[PDB]
């Protein structure tokens, strides 16, 4: 019910983080606290941690 999108590219070094490009969309799996949220890409389908501030609501800008 709440979808976010890549404002910028990001590329991971750790296997548990999710690499992506700008425009890649995301469903959020874990807003535990860590500003690194768990997310699923709507482009690949893959799941892993991403930096929260790289993504924006599909309702704002």
């Amino acid at each position: 019910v709440t979808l976010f999108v890549a404002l910028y590219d990001y590329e991971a070094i750790t296997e548990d983080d999710l690499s992506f490009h700008k425009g890649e969309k995301f469903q959020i799996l874990n807003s535990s606290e860590g500003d690194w949220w768990e997310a699923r890409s709507l482009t690949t389908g893959e799941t892993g941690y991403i930096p929260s501030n790289y993504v924006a609501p599909v309702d704002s800008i």
Binding site: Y8, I13, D16, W36, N53
Partner: protein, 105 residues
């Protein structure tokens, strides 16, 4: 330029993941140490991956310098003080730093 990522605490896993990434890329392996170089690394990592740069430290004293953070698997090796980055998989299984300088823990 893409902006700063959020801060997150280092973990054994992350340390290891990175060790291996930098070995895989080669790059660091066999490069001569320098405060400036190390700062360059610490920056890239802190900005790109959000890990605070207090982790990539090594033991003091003449001879080989062993890493303080468990699972950072690069040591600094004299060559002929004057040191070069050297990878060592054993350092993922052994905390040589703690064995030699347990006063830090």
């Amino acid at each position: 330029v893409r902006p700063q990522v959020p801060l997150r605490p280092m973990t054994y896993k992350a340390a290891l993941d990175i060790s291996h990434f930098l070995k895989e890329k080669g790059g660091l392996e066999g490069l001569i140490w320098s405060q400036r170089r190390q700062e360059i690394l610490d920056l890239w990592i802190y900005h790109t991956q959000g890990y605070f740069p207090d982790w990539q430290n090594y033991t003091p004293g003449p001879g080989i310098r062993y890493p303080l953070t468990f699972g950072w698997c690069f040591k600094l090796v004299p060559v002929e003080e004057v040191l070069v980055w050297r990878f060592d998989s054993k350092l993922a299984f052994h905390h040589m730093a703690r064995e030699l300088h347990p006063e830090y823990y």
